[PDB]
Design an enzyme around this catalytic site. Structure first.
Site, PDB file in Angstrom:
ATOM      1  N   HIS A  40       0.796  -1.286  -0.028  1.00 48.68           N
ATOM      2  CA  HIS A  40       0.040   0.063   0.196  1.00 48.68           C
ATOM      3  C   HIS A  40       0.769   1.284   0.021  1.00 48.68           C
ATOM      4  O   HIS A  40       0.296   2.234  -0.063  1.00 48.68           O
ATOM      5  CB  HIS A  40      -1.116  -0.033   1.121  1.00 48.68           C
ATOM      6  CG  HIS A  40      -0.552   0.287   2.536  1.00 48.68           C
ATOM      7  ND1 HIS A  40      -0.186  -0.645   3.406  1.00 48.68           N
ATOM      8  CD2 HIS A  40      -0.568   1.547   3.141  1.00 48.68           C
ATOM      9  CE1 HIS A  40       0.098   0.093   4.387  1.00 48.68           C
ATOM     10  NE2 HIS A  40      -0.086   1.332   4.498  1.00 48.68           N
ATOM     11  N   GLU A  52      19.282   6.775   8.878  1.00 49.79           N
ATOM     12  CA  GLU A  52      18.572   7.858   9.218  1.00 49.79           C
ATOM     13  C   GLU A  52      18.204   7.701  10.618  1.00 49.79           C
ATOM     14  O   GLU A  52      18.105   6.623  11.132  1.00 49.79           O
ATOM     15  CB  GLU A  52      17.063   8.151   8.346  1.00 49.79           C
ATOM     16  CG  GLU A  52      17.216   8.445   6.967  1.00 49.79           C
ATOM     17  CD  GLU A  52      17.681  10.135   7.050  1.00 49.79           C
ATOM     18  OE1 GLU A  52      18.030  10.698   7.860  1.00 49.79           O
ATOM     19  OE2 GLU A  52      17.410  10.777   5.783  1.00 49.79           O
ATOM     20  N   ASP A  84      -0.363  -7.638   1.712  1.00 50.76           N
ATOM     21  CA  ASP A  84       0.410  -6.151   1.803  1.00 50.76           C
ATOM     22  C   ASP A  84       1.715  -6.242   1.883  1.00 50.76           C
ATOM     23  O   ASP A  84       2.468  -5.899   2.899  1.00 50.76           O
ATOM     24  CB  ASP A  84      -0.318  -5.354   2.876  1.00 50.76           C
ATOM     25  CG  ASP A  84      -0.010  -3.877   2.919  1.00 50.76           C
ATOM     26  OD1 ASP A  84       0.204  -3.596   1.885  1.00 50.76           O
ATOM     27  OD2 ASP A  84      -0.424  -3.029   3.692  1.00 50.76           O
ATOM     28  N   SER A 172       1.579   1.236  16.498  1.00 53.18           N
ATOM     29  CA  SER A 172       1.981   2.061  15.381  1.00 53.18           C
ATOM     30  C   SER A 172       0.841   2.909  14.538  1.00 53.18           C
ATOM     31  O   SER A 172      -0.139   2.680  14.985  1.00 53.18           O
ATOM     32  CB  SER A 172       2.634   1.106  14.215  1.00 53.18           C
ATOM     33  OG  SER A 172       1.624   0.301  13.877  1.00 53.18           O
ATOM     34  N   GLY A 175       2.078   6.599   8.530  1.00 51.60           N
ATOM     35  CA  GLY A 175       3.504   7.013   8.359  1.00 51.60           C
ATOM     36  C   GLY A 175       4.424   6.032   9.009  1.00 51.60           C
ATOM     37  O   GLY A 175       5.655   5.969   8.460  1.00 51.60           O
ATOM     38  N   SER A 177       3.650   2.679   8.222  1.00 48.27           N
ATOM     39  CA  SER A 177       3.588   1.627   7.281  1.00 48.27           C
ATOM     40  C   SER A 177       4.691   1.383   6.335  1.00 48.27           C
ATOM     41  O   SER A 177       5.439   2.212   6.167  1.00 48.27           O
ATOM     42  CB  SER A 177       2.223   2.444   6.213  1.00 48.27           C
ATOM     43  OG  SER A 177       1.171   2.411   6.653  1.00 48.27           O
ATOM     44  N   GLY A 178       4.634   0.333   6.213  1.00 48.67           N
ATOM     45  CA  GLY A 178       5.834  -0.427   5.469  1.00 48.67           C
ATOM     46  C   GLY A 178       6.665  -0.846   6.332  1.00 48.67           C
ATOM     47  O   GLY A 178       7.937  -1.586   5.805  1.00 48.67           O
TER      48      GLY A 178
HETATM   49 CA    CA Z   1      19.148  12.519   8.598  1.00 45.74          CA
END
Ligand code: CA
Length: 223
Positions: A40, A52, A84, A172, A175, A177-178
């Site tokens: 999705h 990150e 999914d 959760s 945002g 998601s995944g």
């Molecule tokens: Ca960064």
């Protein structure tokens, strides 16, 4: 993630952010050239961002790599969210170390009661909106199939499991998601759906990764 804690920079080294000008979904690095996420989350023109912590500040451990190919599961149904799951191939191999690392695929399916780590940059509120700049973490157990089906009558397939707390307050959210659900050092879930976030008797629903290992391995071997 609602009701979680700040992970700490690069403590979740397989976590990726999918970017199309802005963060829109999470994902998990499964080897140096492939990422798994939710179907999705599909978009054309994805940049995968590895290493990150703060997604709004260049901190020095990032790797930004464009996707060369996306493969949504052949049986993905966008109405039911059955199957999914999606694979994303990177244009070039990531550089792996302690802060950017792959997560192993499971050998077996995890049982109800197993504690798992869920992570992402999604909304941190159950009502209203607040998106964090740094990665958030939540420890949550896998719920029994019976409790999952009782929470969402007629909606849970054999390819989904529930994890979280029936009392609400920790979940959760949009945002996330995944993103990964890791249990005993293995990827067991993908953040998929739920009714609102952190609501009573409405836990998170996750894609059951152990059902997809054959398809993932065969796909990687040929693409
Ligand atoms: Ca960064």
């Amino acid at each position: 993630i609602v009701g979680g804690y700040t992970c700490g920079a690069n403590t979740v080294p397989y976590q990726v952010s999918l970017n199309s000008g802005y963060h829109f979904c999470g994902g998990s690095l499964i080897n140096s050239q492939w990422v798994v996420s939710a179907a999705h989350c599909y978009k054309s023109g994805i940049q995968v961002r590895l290493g990150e912590d703060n997604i709004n500040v260049v901190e020095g451990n990032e790797q930004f790599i464009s996707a060369s190919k996306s493969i949504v599961h052949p049986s993905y149904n966008s109405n039911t969210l059955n199957n999914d799951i999606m694979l994303i191939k990177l244009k070039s191999a990531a550089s792996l170390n302690s802060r950017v690392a792959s997560i192993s695929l499971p050998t077996s399916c995890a049982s109800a009661g197993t504690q798992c780590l869920i992570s992402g940059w999604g909304n941190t509120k159950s009502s209203g909106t607040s998106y964090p700049d740094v990665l958030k973490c939540l420890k949550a157990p896998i719920l029994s199939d019976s409790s999952c089906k009782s929470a969402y009558p007629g909606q849970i397939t054999s390819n989904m499991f529930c994890a979280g707390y029936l009392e609400g307050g920790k979940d959760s959210c949009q945002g996330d998601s995944g993103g990964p659900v890791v249990c005993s050092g293995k990827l067991q879930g993908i953040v998929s759906w739920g009714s609102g976030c952190a609501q009573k008797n409405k836990p998170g629903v996750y894609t059951k990764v152990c059902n997809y290992v054959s398809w993932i391995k065969q796909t990687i071997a040929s693409n």
